[PDB]
Structure 1
Amino acid sequence: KFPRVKNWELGSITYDTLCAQSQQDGPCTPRRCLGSLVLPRKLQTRPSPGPPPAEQLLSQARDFINQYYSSIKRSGSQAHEERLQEVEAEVASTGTYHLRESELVFGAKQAWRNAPRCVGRIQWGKLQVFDARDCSSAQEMFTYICNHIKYATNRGNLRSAITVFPQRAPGRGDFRIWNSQLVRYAGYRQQDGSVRGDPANVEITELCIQHGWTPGNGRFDVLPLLLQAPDEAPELFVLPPELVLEVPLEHPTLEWFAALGLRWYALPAVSNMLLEIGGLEFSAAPFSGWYMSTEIGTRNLCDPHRYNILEDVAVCMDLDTRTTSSLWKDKAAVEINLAVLHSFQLAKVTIVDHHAATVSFMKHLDNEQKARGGCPADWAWIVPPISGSLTPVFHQEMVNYILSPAFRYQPDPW
């Protein structure tokens, strides 16, 4: 039942007993493993044709309340039994319930802790939770978002934060941030099918223009936010420049790197995922921490379907682009990730390289084994995009499963 987990670098073994607490099913079966798929339509928390069955919601709620009181050690106190009574009364009468701010804070931190694809969970206990459940308009969503950004950025000394907007109600539309991240660069599909900017943001850039945004023509034009209040069309909001801290990229030894004009924002804030706590769903709950260098230098800048700068840098470095055997791609990529670490460190902006991050994740796995008897992790996401075996996580076996609270993927509002 319980999987034997092994580290091949050190020969050490552990048994994951935490996976037994999983109540939600993944995409795999004994016939075939689908663990490398980014998003199966299954785990995804899509819309519904009404209110969840009261029995199911109630059991997820009682479970969460049980988790919370256990955390503060008051498991069994009258406060626990009374909170469970309150939840039952509210659900039975209204088909739903609401969380207290202390519970929402514990829930947000626990959802991060339970996030399989996250390599920075060693910081899970240090999270600023902004309660925005008293938001009623898109204009309000914007002020809360700007507050999140100003707080998280902190002049360069980044701080992990999450802003939780109103939960989903069966009788109305969701509060949604249409942008995948709070900060994104525009992607303009040119004449020749080409793309000026970030090709990953072509669809959202089009939507922004459609809703009245006057576009630019640069490779790094920060997009405005499309915030949606229940059953209302999304509204356009331009982010104040002083709020968006950006870092111009230059290399420590290659003088010509700066000339490439590359730059990336400091704040990584995912804004399209759904936070589920005790059966309650928060369709708008942007979260942010700090970047791991490979996200920018390898994925964002070197992916073929992204900025695709590999060959440009290779030519500047004057490498042999004729054959793959010269390893020109590998050489260019290393210098690009180096430029990212150098530039952010020069600008006094928080980053963490993949070696430092993965070593900390290994410590986190150890903390978790002793604390909960395991830790759900997605090997394909945890192992960085370059120099995989050069990091300790590559040599670590991992067990992946879904625990709640959890951040889940959800359908696009359009």
Structure 2
Amino acid sequence: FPRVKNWEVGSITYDTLSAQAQQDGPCTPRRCLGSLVFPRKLAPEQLLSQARDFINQYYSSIKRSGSQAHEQRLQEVEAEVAATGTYQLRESELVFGAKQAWRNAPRCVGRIQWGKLQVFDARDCRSAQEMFTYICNHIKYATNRGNLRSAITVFPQRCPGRGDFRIWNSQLVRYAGYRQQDGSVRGDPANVEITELCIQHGWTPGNGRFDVLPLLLQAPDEPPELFLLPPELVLEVPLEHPTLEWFAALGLRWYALPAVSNMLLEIGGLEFPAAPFSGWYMSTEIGTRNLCDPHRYNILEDVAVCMDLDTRTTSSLWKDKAAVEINVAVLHSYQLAKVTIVDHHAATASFMKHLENEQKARGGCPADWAWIVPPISGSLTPVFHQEMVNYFLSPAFRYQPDPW
């Protein structure tokens, strides 16, 4: 049982939940690989063992372990797999597992919200036109005129026998990335590849550096087809600064809804390759990572020139000063547009509260320090001084290969 200390307060706890960790991560006694983004690389007897485990903690979470339907639900799954090789989740189990996956996500700092999650069951979907309509309900429900609500849509599980629902975009809302004669990009460089596949599947390329891409939706077997997102469904925030009047003229925008559409949800040994989930942004994601990373929009220098900062020397801290104001403008712009956003101080403080809750509830919490600490002002947030244990629990969101 690892001893975990908070250096700001001096308090000590023990992570007993780590003992119950299963799918081993990347580290060994000889070397630590915690800083790697994708760890390592990406007879149905093993299906019954994960299904029974998952069914077990479901009845634990409603008191009703011991006698009653708990005994009985164990049989249906045993029979369902003996007869078919797989099994179907009861609607509430699918809800419980979807929330557990989010609760167990070590890299997510917003897990204080894990109990409030809207789970659309799209398991009877059997068409790429049908998915699109599901995806559009979600986006409309999640966005909710800017009062964001966390939501996930669960498309049908993978079944042995040829067939996989899949979204090809990494997110539901992505900005285009246009190569050109320099090789340099106009738009989002992280989306150069998918902008390529969008064009080579028919898409009409666009204007400039903030063009919402079309979706590439893939019903089982039959190849992907292009779908266009209606402009009124993609809510976007133009970026302005409360006191730097020229900032709006930079023409910067970002969208309202962060909706990850390329991870695999795994519940009780079942695999859902299309299960797009969505929440609301923390502002450093937009201001710091999306707009200021050198391999993203890389705007830092341009904002510094406008601020008349001494870009001739690193010791002026001109990068730090410009980055803060970008984050100021992001927070101001989403607020002025009445769009849910959370600053990194508010988020980390709520995560500490989530840590304390989980200590009482489950005796610990998996957390990946490197992703929990924000990308600016790290030691100014309370999570920086909190030691954390990282390990994999199920149900979980997992990374999955790409459909090409």
Q: Secondary structure of the equivalent of 2:316?
A: coil
Q: What do residues 121-168 of structure 1 show as CA deviations (whole Å, max 9, x unaligned)?
A: 000000000000000011100000000000000001000000000001
Q: Distance in 1 between matches of 2:67 and 2:166?
A: 38
| 1:403 Cα offset (Å) | 0.2
Q: Distance in 2 between matches of 1:345 and 1:78?
A: 50
Identify which range, 63-72 or 333-342, moves more after superposition. Answer: 63-72
Equivalent of 1:392, from 379, 382, 398?
Answer: 382
Q: Distance in 2 between matches of 1:326 and 1:28?
A: 39
| 1:343 Cα offset (Å) | 0.3
| 1:108 Cα offset (Å) | 0.2
Q: What do residues 220-249 of structure 1 show as CA deviations (whole Å, max 9, x unaligned)?
A: 000000000111110100001100000000
Alignment partner of 1:88 is 2:78: yes
Once superposed, what is the RMSD of the aligned Cα atoms? Answer: 0.7
Q: What do residues 162-188 of structure 1 show as CA deviations (whole Å, max 9, x unaligned)?
A: 000000111113100000000000000
| 1:78 Cα offset (Å) | 2.6
Q: What do residues 314-345 of structure 1 show as CA deviations (whole Å, max 9, x unaligned)?
A: 00001111111111100000000000000000
| 1:40 Cα offset (Å) | 2.1
- Contact 1:188 / 1:195 at 8 angstroms: preserved in 2? yes
Q: Distance in 2 between matches of 1:402 and 1:40?
A: 12
| 1:76 Cα offset (Å) | 1.7
Q: What do residues 328-372 of structure 1 show as CA deviations (whole Å, max 9, x unaligned)?
A: 100000000000000000000000000000000000000000000
Question: What is the match of residue 380 of structure 1?
Answer: 370
- Contact 1:199 / 1:306 at 8 angstroms: preserved in 2? yes
Q: Distance in 1 between matches of 2:239 and 2:340?
A: 14
Q: Distance in 2 between matches of 1:359 and 1:18?
A: 22
Q: Secondary structure of the equivalent of 1:202?
A: helix
Q: Distance in 1 between matches of 2:328 and 2:347?
A: 15
Q: Secondary structure of the equivalent of 2:153?
A: strand
Residues 41 and 413 of structure 1, relative CA distance in 2, 3 Å threshold: farther
Alignment partner of 1:306 is 2:296: yes
Q: What do residues 228-287 of structure 1 show as CA deviations (whole Å, max 9, x unaligned)?
A: 011111010000110000000000100000000001000000000000000000000000
Q: Secondary structure of the equivalent of 1:389?
A: helix
Q: Secondary structure of the equivalent of 1:130?
A: strand
| 1:217 Cα offset (Å) | 2.5
- Contact 1:27 / 1:42 at 8 angstroms: preserved in 2? no
| 1:95 Cα offset (Å) | 1.3
Count of matched residue positions in the alignment of Structure 1 and Structure 2: 403
Q: Secondary structure of the equivalent of 2:77?
A: helix
Question: What is the match of residue 28 of structure 1?
Answer: 27
| 1:91 Cα offset (Å) | 1.1
TM-score if structure 2 supplies the norm length? 0.99
Q: Secondary structure of the equivalent of 1:154?
A: helix
| 1:42 Cα offset (Å) | 4.0
Q: Distance in 2 between matches of 1:207 and 1:77?
A: 54
Q: Secondary structure of the equivalent of 2:315?
A: coil
Q: Secondary structure of the equivalent of 2:338?
A: coil
Alignment partner of 1:290 is 2:280: yes
- Contact 1:26 / 1:42 at 8 angstroms: preserved in 2? no
| 1:215 Cα offset (Å) | 0.8
Question: What is the match of residue 50 of structure 1?
Answer: none
Equivalent of 2:220, from 227, 230, 249?
Answer: 230
Q: Secondary structure of the equivalent of 1:204?
A: helix
Percent identity of paired positions between Structure 1 and Structure 2? 96
- Contact 1:15 / 1:374 at 8 angstroms: preserved in 2? yes
- Contact 1:6 / 1:13 at 8 angstroms: preserved in 2? yes
Q: What do residues 30-73 of structure 1 show as CA deviations (whole Å, max 9, x unaligned)?
A: 01000000002446xxxxxxxxxx22110100000001111111
Identify which range, 169-178 or 121-130, moves more after superposition. Answer: 169-178
- Contact 1:172 / 1:231 at 8 angstroms: preserved in 2? yes
- Contact 1:188 / 1:217 at 8 angstroms: preserved in 2? no
Q: Distance in 1 between matches of 2:119 and 2:260?
A: 15
Q: Distance in 2 between matches of 1:340 and 1:227?
A: 31
Q: Distance in 2 between matches of 1:386 and 1:180?
A: 24
- Contact 1:196 / 1:217 at 8 angstroms: preserved in 2? no
Q: Distance in 2 between matches of 1:136 and 1:6?
A: 50
| 1:298 Cα offset (Å) | 0.1
Q: Distance in 1 between matches of 2:78 and 2:312?
A: 69
- Contact 1:293 / 1:341 at 8 angstroms: preserved in 2? yes
Give unmatched runs, 5+ long, in structure 1: 44-53
Give unmatched runs, 5+ long, in structure 2: none
Q: Secondary structure of the equivalent of 2:9?
A: coil
